Design a binder for this molecule. Structure first.
Ligand SMILES: [Zn+2]
Ligand SMILES: [Zn+2]
Ligand SMILES: [Zn+2]
Ligand SMILES: [Zn+2]
Ligand SMILES: [Zn+2]
Ligand SMILES: [Zn+2]
Ligand SMILES: [Zn+2]
Ligand SMILES: [Zn+2]
Ligand SMILES: [Zn+2]
Ligand SMILES: [Zn+2]
Length: 77
C-alpha cells in the first residue's frame, strides 16, 4: 500500500466515512463531517501510523486529505 492509500485509510477510519468520500481535495470538516475533536484525534492517529511527531504549527494547516498526504510524504520516518 502506498503512503497516499494508507493516509486515506486512516482518515476514513478516524472520521468514520466511506472510502469513496475520501477524495484528495476533500475537507475533513466541510466534506467528511468531522468535528474539531475528531481532527485532533486524526492528527494523533497519523502520528502513530507513520511514526512521526507533527508540530502544532503544521497540524493546524492539515484540513484536507491532500494536506495530510503532503505532510506525511514530506516527513518520512
Ligand atoms: Zn493500491
Ligand atoms: Zn485500517
Ligand atoms: Zn459519508
Ligand atoms: Zn462522491
Ligand atoms: Zn457549514
Ligand atoms: Zn474523542
Ligand atoms: Zn504516541
Ligand atoms: Zn494538535
Ligand atoms: Zn493546534
Ligand atoms: Zn515539518
Amino acid at each position: 500500500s502506498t503512503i497516499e492509500e494508507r493516509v486515506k485509510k486512516i482518515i476514513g477510519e478516524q472520521l468514520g466515512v466511506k472510502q469513496e468520500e475520501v477524495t484528495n481535495n476533500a475537507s475533513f470538516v466541510e466534506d467528511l463531517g468531522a468535528d474539531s475533536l475528531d481532527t485532533v484525534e486524526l492528527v494523533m492517529a497519523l502520528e502513530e501510523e507513520f511514526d512521526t511527531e507533527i508540530p502544532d504549527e503544521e497540524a493546524e494547516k492539515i484540513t484536507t486529505v491532500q494536506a495530510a498526504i503532503d505532510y506525511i510524504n514530506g516527513h518520512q520516518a
